[PDB]
Amino acid sequence: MNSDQVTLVGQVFESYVSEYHKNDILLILKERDEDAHYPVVVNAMTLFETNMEIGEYFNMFPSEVLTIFDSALRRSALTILQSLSQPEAVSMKQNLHARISGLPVCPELVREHIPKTKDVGHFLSVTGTVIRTSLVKVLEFERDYMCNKCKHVFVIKADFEQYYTFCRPSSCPSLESCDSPTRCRDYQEIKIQEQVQRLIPRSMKVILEDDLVDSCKSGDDLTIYGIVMQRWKPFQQDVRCEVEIVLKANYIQVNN
Amino acid sequence: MNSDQVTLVGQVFESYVSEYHKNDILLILKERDEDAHYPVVVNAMTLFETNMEIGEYFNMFPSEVLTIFDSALRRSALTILQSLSQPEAVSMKQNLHARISGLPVCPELVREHIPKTKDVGHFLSVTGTVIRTSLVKVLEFERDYMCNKCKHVFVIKADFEQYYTFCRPSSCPSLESCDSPTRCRDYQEIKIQEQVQRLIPRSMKVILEDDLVDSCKSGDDLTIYGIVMQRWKPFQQDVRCEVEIVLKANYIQVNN
Amino acid sequence: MNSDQVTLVGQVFESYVSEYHKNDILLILKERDEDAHYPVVVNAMTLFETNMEIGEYFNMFPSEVLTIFDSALRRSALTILQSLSQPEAVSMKQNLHARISGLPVCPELVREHIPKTKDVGHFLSVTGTVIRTSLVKVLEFERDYMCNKCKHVFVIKADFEQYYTFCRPSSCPSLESCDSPTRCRDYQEIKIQEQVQRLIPRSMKVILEDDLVDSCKSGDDLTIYGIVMQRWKPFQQDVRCEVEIVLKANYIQVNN
Amino acid sequence: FIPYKGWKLYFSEVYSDSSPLIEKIQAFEKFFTRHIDLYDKDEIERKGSILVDFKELTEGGEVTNLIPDIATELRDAPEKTLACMGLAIHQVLTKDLERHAAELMVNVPHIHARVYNYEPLTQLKNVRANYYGKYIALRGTVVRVSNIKPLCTKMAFLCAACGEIQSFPLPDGKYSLPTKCPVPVCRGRSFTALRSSPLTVTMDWQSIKIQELMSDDQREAGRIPRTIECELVHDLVDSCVPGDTVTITGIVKVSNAEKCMFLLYIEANSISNS
Amino acid sequence: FIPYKGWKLYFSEVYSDSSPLIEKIQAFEKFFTRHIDLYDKDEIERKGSILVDFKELTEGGEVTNLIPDIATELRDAPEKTLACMGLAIHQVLTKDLERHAAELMVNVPHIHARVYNYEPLTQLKNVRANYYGKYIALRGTVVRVSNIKPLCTKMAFLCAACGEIQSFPLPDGKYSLPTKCPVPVCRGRSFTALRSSPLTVTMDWQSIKIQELMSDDQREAGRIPRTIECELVHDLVDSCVPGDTVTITGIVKVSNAEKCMFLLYIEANSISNS
Amino acid sequence: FIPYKGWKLYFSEVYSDSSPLIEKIQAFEKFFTRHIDLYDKDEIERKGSILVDFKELTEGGEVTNLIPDIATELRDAPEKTLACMGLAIHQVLTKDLERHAAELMVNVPHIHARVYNYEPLTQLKNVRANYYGKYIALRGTVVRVSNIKPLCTKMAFLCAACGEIQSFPLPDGKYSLPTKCPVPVCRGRSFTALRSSPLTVTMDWQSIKIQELMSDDQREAGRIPRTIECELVHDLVDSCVPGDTVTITGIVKVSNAEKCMFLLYIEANSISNS
């Protein structure tokens, strides 16, 4: 993307959250613990009505917008902390998150059927019930492994498209020609079956993560606003490769 | 074998088939399709009575006789096609086969019991019922693999005694010192259990092939005229090797 | 241990066995077969009250005492054979064994509960019933393998702590710098469950060996006088090693 | 300079004006050009499907006038004859769109061909060995509809040294390696996967089991009729429910790894209903 | 020259008078020296257990007078604060025994520390990610008592060339190799096992499953309460029967090989009853 | 020059007039020569079996007159004593056939030996360790007759460089390799299989399970009597049906791979009935 576009999106987000989201930020700041997790709920229709350029920049790459909004929220947190009058019952948190809700009623964004293969990288909204439920488990994210034959440390990350496996690097990004677990998250696995009232239906393997864990009850109606992505499998010689379609959740609702 | 013996077998076979088998050859020729399969039924007692040397040459090496009779049938087909008066409703087939029937009533050729191990390479005749039945499947016969380091192409075949596996050649039959799937067949697997009326009996794993596929009904009396051979298994170090006795069918009957 | 201690233990044992155990030795000698097996029962309280040094030397290293008593028994057999008056109905046996019984009533030697991990290398006495029973099987003990690159043969033995596996030697004990199955035993496996009358109880996997095989009936009260030892498992990289506690029997009783 | 812009998506071969397929190309393009004003542009634009009727080809038009070997060529050659019709459709649609735009750019996607209404009904119990890679027709019911799972056919690979990544046409979902890279020059290798770039393309999949009807030959033996599988590829799926009366026309191929032990299945090319 | 003879059994580091742990060392040793004449010597001599009450430490004695950071240090540092108390107990017991012997040698064994009565009750349904390696407290019942099986923590290794065998402190029952041997001089390697020498030490083990009480939050959903495992190490075992009301305090660690897929379990450090 | 033509089929050793087996050879051949005119030639000619009675050997004939060590030699040596009788039978039969042909060539096949009616009945519950490779006798019933499956004992190998293929006597159906080839000269190897030449020989096989009778020792404990397997080799098979009263005499060998964990089974050498 262009250099100015991300910046402009940042100012739009920070202005909106500063003008109409002071109360939730104030309550989040006035809380115990330092690094657990803290989300912020932001509506959509008002934001897209305020400016006609955020929607175009958003609904083709649902990847950078969330990170930019997170950065804007962090900058707002720094600003409100700096301009504070009662610095006694307050605490600073470095773990904030975004949560979009309130999409339009366009026929292509309120799909009641699972997309087959033509919706990858899009922002959708599916509805259904719950069948199965896995157990709470903890992943490892980033290693910062020991520096070999050079000096500057590395910050390589994991990959979601390869079942969270780590690839061994060999080409160091060092300027010269030289080239050679206190981190945790949360996890879960839920399966959603389409309702028969509005129709045999098939099912999706929705993947939850972070604060959304432990928020579903077996046998309840859900409405998830998540991105659709693909999960590969390690390749074997002269066989048929296997793929699957999952839905990384970005919000949730308990509407019934 | 001697050079003249196979030739003499050829002339006697072609003479007999031309003298008493014009009608079946004519019907086989006057048929649609070019390369499916086409069998010919030939009696045995009359042929062995006509000449006293064909039986001796036959009932010790029951491998070359069938191929020689097939070649004689092909030559007879060529002769009839050349000497034909109505070359409009005719078609030429290059896939012919032999099928011997009508063996004598000698006690050593009408065995009602399964041979143990002393009948390998003999022509027998067993009777029994049917228990199991496998599925129709297709093999690969011959590869004509890509020529490496030399020029003349190779026509290596398969091996029935090794569960249809291919051995990698390294000693080229080339005159000099240099040395380095549009083909299909049919297959099946049937099991025959000895009748108790003429007697616990054991069972043989009769192997069917080619046109004989899909010619047996579960729970019917059969009478197979086939050769007996052995099937090996790949060798493992310091274990007991495993063998088995099978019966490659060369005819079949639905006598009941 | 000191050189004189083992010798003194030897003379004490041979003196006692010659003074109070002529009759059983005489019956053992006057028997058929040459190399089957033959045990001798010796009491403990009389031996320990006879000399106040045998008990101390015994009840901290219950390994050398049994072998020394076996050697003393063999020497006594040699002496009785040499000083014999009727050398006609006699036979020499080279397979003798020891069997201790009659321990004191000290609270730490009549334990009615299974030791957890603080009794390794001690002589105990447990009581219980029988649950399971394995099958009679035969081991291989010592190989006397072919001599390679040197002359004197090797007499390496097996290891009980490694599930009876053989380690490949490479450092020859030869004086110079040079360095590179007609044997059988018996075996069994029995499980003992603690009685509930004198108390859920756990179970021990008692290992029987040699002449003691085929001496237990499923559902009978036992009283074993055996040593406690540990059995390891082959190591795998970056896993938790597994151990177990067994009880190598040295006597048995059918008290009920 | 090639008049047919979509050459890369279609036949993968260096463009040379020597193949005999060219004459069939003009024959098909002329036939489609004359009979062009009867198709809804949007339907073909979205879902590639030209429901060409074989009776029209049999009617003795220019298709047989220019070349008389149509039935034999179709039966013996499964792909060469089939994809030429798609090439002609793509070319004529591109030309029409270009003319319309010029009167008052164009990136029309892949369009499949659909040849249905095939007369000689080669029913089951007769497809054993010979009918391998020959266009045939069947008739039966459906009993074992399965679930949908995607697959990839043109996943890309990484490049060595300089750039110029490629989208090697991997065949029928079997992983392979591009031991050669054409590129401008120099060595190949470059064996690495890049399964994130938009070069990779995927499509749907399914599997159907057919049990052939009672027909005739009322044998007393209780042998259940033979069953042969089917494989729907793209723009199909959810077109059948358990228990129908459908006619399926498609190529007969040989599977693997049910070890030279294979079975027979049919890759569908057109479906009907009743 | 080290005043603390049991340095090798305790903290494994080269003795240098620069660590900040020394101050906590004399603080703990003074606190134990003042309050020393209330413990039965035989019980501690046989089974290492000092049932120190946290209320006494909270009472504002010299423990907080010398260093005020006791609660934060205990919560953030699991082992550094915990094992200093064992060091102090070992030193004071050795000094007392030496004085008694001199008035009228000493090989006192390992003694564990036991800190119980922890006030902030961090009950379940709130230990997901953050509480990793932090001292906490629970409350629940026991339902799945298991069987006993030993394990080794300090099994010895063989030596190369000359003698000087070693007893490398293998961590938490995971096999490793001593790629370096300190010894006097020269090369290491010496990768061989000697699992017969008295250098190898073993201890007991167990496993307990806890189902947390009804407490509150009477939700209608039939989700069974979450369960977390426990691991008793030594001088414990046979202290619980199926169905109790116990309070467990211990460190929270992360298991492996239930492949970066792990769970959470608690290594117990003190148990109570009711 | 060897009087015994079938030396290769029998004992596999270079012919030298120094072994002590020769004297036993003349003893057996003389004993058979005197008592030769009581056997039906056709039966031995087809199925190799000489039903020698041990009472005749015990009767003090030339068998004990020439060498008195017959029972001890038979018990201690399983094969050396047993195969000499077969060698003598082969030699005498060949000589008789040659004389008959000359008065008015010879390729008599392998003939096994059969020594039955063994007096000392070493019944079960006493064969644990010592009775390994010692000729014994049993008595019991049969309950677990199995199916027939062939095996090979003398399968051939391929040859290196020039010809001169061989038929290495593979032992007891365990695959091995001829690291040395005697041949005329030069190197060995030639590790290749030729399992089609008529050099390979195959024979039958079976397996029987014996449950020993009630006998005596009416213990109250419900321990079922011990069971030991049997293995019929050749010219036997289908000689027993489930539930008999048979007497079996044969060598006791040790199996493998039920890893130095083995069991005990008996290779039969003679069967009777009642």
CATH number of residue B190's parent domain: 2.40.50.140
At residue A92's C-alpha, the angle toward residues A89 and A93, to 5°, is 130
Distance between B165 CA and the closest CA of chain D, angstroms: 8
Backbone angles phi, psi at B13, to 5 degrees: -60, -50
Asked if residue C213 lies in contact with residue C186, where contact means CB atoms within 8 angstroms, the answer is yes
On chain C, the residues whose CB falls within 8 A of the CB of E237 are 116
Asked if residue F230 lies in contact with residue F173, where contact means CB atoms within 8 angstroms, the answer is no
Residue of A nearest to D257 (CA): A239
Task: Report how this structure was experimentally obtained.
Answer: cryo-EM
Asked if residue D239 lies in contact with residue D142, where contact means CB atoms within 8 angstroms, the answer is no
The bridge status of strand B100-101 relative to strand B42-43 is parallel
Please give the structure tokens belonging to residue F243.
């539930």
Asked if residue A114 lies in contact with residue A202, where contact means CB atoms within 8 angstroms, the answer is yes
Residues A223 and A131 in one domain: yes
Residues B219 and B165 in one domain: no
Q: Is residue C117 part of a domain?
A: no
Residue A29 belongs to domain with CATH number: 3.30.1640.10
Distance between B121 CA and the closest CA of chain F, angstroms: 11
Number of domains in chain C: 3
Q: Is residue A71 part of a domain?
A: yes
Distance between C63 CA and the closest CA of chain E, angstroms: 14
Asked if residue B91 lies in contact with residue B84, where contact means CB atoms within 8 angstroms, the answer is no
Please give the structure tokens belonging to residue D7.
């050459």
Query: D260 and B186: CB-CB below 8 Å?
Result: no
Residue of B nearest to D228 (CA): B136
Q: Taking the CB of residue F260, how many other CB atoms lie within 10 A of it?
A: 15
Query: F237 Cβ partners below 8 Å, 6+ apart?
Result: B116, F148, F204, F205, F206
Instruction: Compute chain C's Rg from CA coordinates.
Output: 21
The verdict on E262 touching A (C-beta cutoff 8 Å) is yes
CA–CA distance, C245 with E149 (Å, rounded to integer): 8
The verdict on B117 touching F (C-beta cutoff 8 Å) is yes
Asked if residue D177 lies in contact with residue D206, where contact means CB atoms within 8 angstroms, the answer is no
- Tabulate helix, strand, coil % of chain C (nearest 5): 25, 20, 55
Instruction: Compute chain F's Rg from CA coordinates.
Output: 21
Query: A245 and D152: CB-CB below 8 Å?
Result: no
Option in A240, A244, A245 nearest D173 (CB)? A240
Q: Taking the CB of residue B225, how many other CB atoms lie within 10 A of it?
A: 21
Query: C176 Cβ partners below 8 Å, 6+ apart?
Result: none
CATH 3.30.1640.10 fits domain E5-116 = yes
On chain B, the residues whose CB falls within 8 A of the CB of D263 are 135, 137-138
Q: Classify the C-alpha dihedral D192-D198-D200-D204 as positive or negative.
A: positive
The bridge status of strand E141-142 relative to strand E208-211 is antiparallel
Asked if residue F188 lies in contact with residue F160, where contact means CB atoms within 8 angstroms, the answer is yes
The verdict on C242 touching E (C-beta cutoff 8 Å) is yes
CA–CA distance, C130 with C194 (Å, rounded to integer): 9
Task: Compute the count of residue pairs across chains B and D with CB atoms less than 8 Å apart.
Answer: 37
Distance between D38 CA and the closest CA of chain B, angstroms: 40
Q: Which of A117, A231, A239 to mutate to test the interface with D (most CBs of D within 10 A)?
A: A117
Please give the structure tokens belonging to residue B11.
């002339």
The verdict on F257 touching C (C-beta cutoff 8 Å) is no
Three-state secondary structure call for residue D193? strand
CA–CA distance, F73 with A223 (Å, rounded to integer): 91
Q: Which conformational region is residue F247 in: left (phi greater than 0), alpha (psi within -120 to 50 degrees), or beta?
A: beta
Asked if residue C98 lies in contact with residue C40, where contact means CB atoms within 8 angstroms, the answer is yes
CA–CA distance, B39 with B215 (Å, rounded to integer): 14
Query: D202 and A117: CB-CB below 8 Å?
Result: yes
List of chains touching C (3+ CB pairs within 8 A): E, F
Q: Is residue C189 part of a domain?
A: yes
CA–CA distance, A131 with E84 (Å, rounded to integer): 52
Residue with the two structure tokens 């900040």? E20
Please give the structure tokens belonging to residue F31.
């004993």
Backbone angles phi, psi at E77, to 5 degrees: -105, 110
List C-alpha distances in Å: D19 to D8, D22, D80, D88.
16, 6, 11, 16
Residues C203 and C237 in one domain: yes
DSSP letter, residue C36: S
Range of the domain at B40: 3-101
Residues A130 and A73 in one domain: no
Option in F223, F226, F254 nearest C138 (CB)? F254
List of chains touching A (3+ CB pairs within 8 A): D, E
Query: F147 and B202: CB-CB below 8 Å?
Result: yes
On chain D, the residues whose CB falls within 8 A of the CB of B137 are 258, 261-263
Distance between E217 CA and the closest CA of chain C, angstroms: 36
Which fold is adopted by the domain F120-150+204-274? OB fold (Dihydrolipoamide Acetyltransferase, E2P) (2.40.50)
In single-letter form, the type of residue at position F33 comes to: T
Residues B163 and B206 in one domain: no
Residues C133 and C162 in one domain: no
Distance between A92 CA and the closest CA of chain D, angstroms: 37
| Residue ranges of E strands in chain D | 50-53, 113-116, 136-137, 141-142, 151-152, 202-203, 208-211, 227-231, 248-254, 264-271
Asked if residue F123 lies in contact with residue F178, where contact means CB atoms within 8 angstroms, the answer is no
- Using a CB cutoff of 8 Å and minimum separation of 24, what contacts does E91-95 make? E91/E3, E91/E4, E91/E6, E91/E29, E92/E29, E92/E32, E92/E33, E92/E36, E93/E41, E93/E44, E93/E45, E94/E5, E94/E6
Residue with the two structure tokens 């050697």? C71
- Tabulate helix, strand, coil % of chain E (nearest 5): 25, 15, 60
On chain C, the residues whose CB falls within 8 A of the CB of E173 are 240-241
Residues B204 and B221 in one domain: yes
In single-letter form, the type of residue at position C73 comes to: L
CA–CA distance, D201 with E149 (Å, rounded to integer): 55
Q: Classify the C-alpha dihedral B62-B64-B70-B75 as positive or negative.
A: negative
CATH 2.40.50.140 fits domain D119-150+204-274 = yes
Residue of A nearest to E254 (CA): A138
The verdict on F128 touching C (C-beta cutoff 8 Å) is yes
Three-state secondary structure call for residue F6? helix
List C-alpha distances in Å: A109 to A252, B88, B194, D235, F67.
16, 68, 70, 22, 106
Q: Is residue C115 part of a domain?
A: no
Domain boundaries, chain D: 5-116, 119-150+204-274, 153-202
Residues B131 and B235 in one domain: yes
The verdict on B108 touching D (C-beta cutoff 8 Å) is no
Q: Which of C156, C160, C184 to mutate to test the interface with F (most CBs of F within 10 A)?
A: C184
Query: D261 and B35: CB-CB below 8 Å?
Result: no
On chain C, the residues whose CB falls within 8 A of the CB of F217 are none
On chain C, the residues whose CB falls within 8 A of the CB of E175 are 235-239, 241
In chain C, which residue ranges form alpha helices assigned H by DSSP? 3-20, 22-29, 45-50, 54-58, 64-82
Residues C165 and C211 in one domain: no
List C-alpha distances in Å: E216 to E209, E220, E245.
21, 12, 17
The bridge status of strand A96-97 relative to strand E208-211 is unpaired
Distance between E261 CA and the closest CA of chain A, angstroms: 6
Closest CA to B129 of B203, B229, B209: B203
Query: E149 and C235: CB-CB below 8 Å?
Result: no
Residue of A nearest to D173 (CA): A240
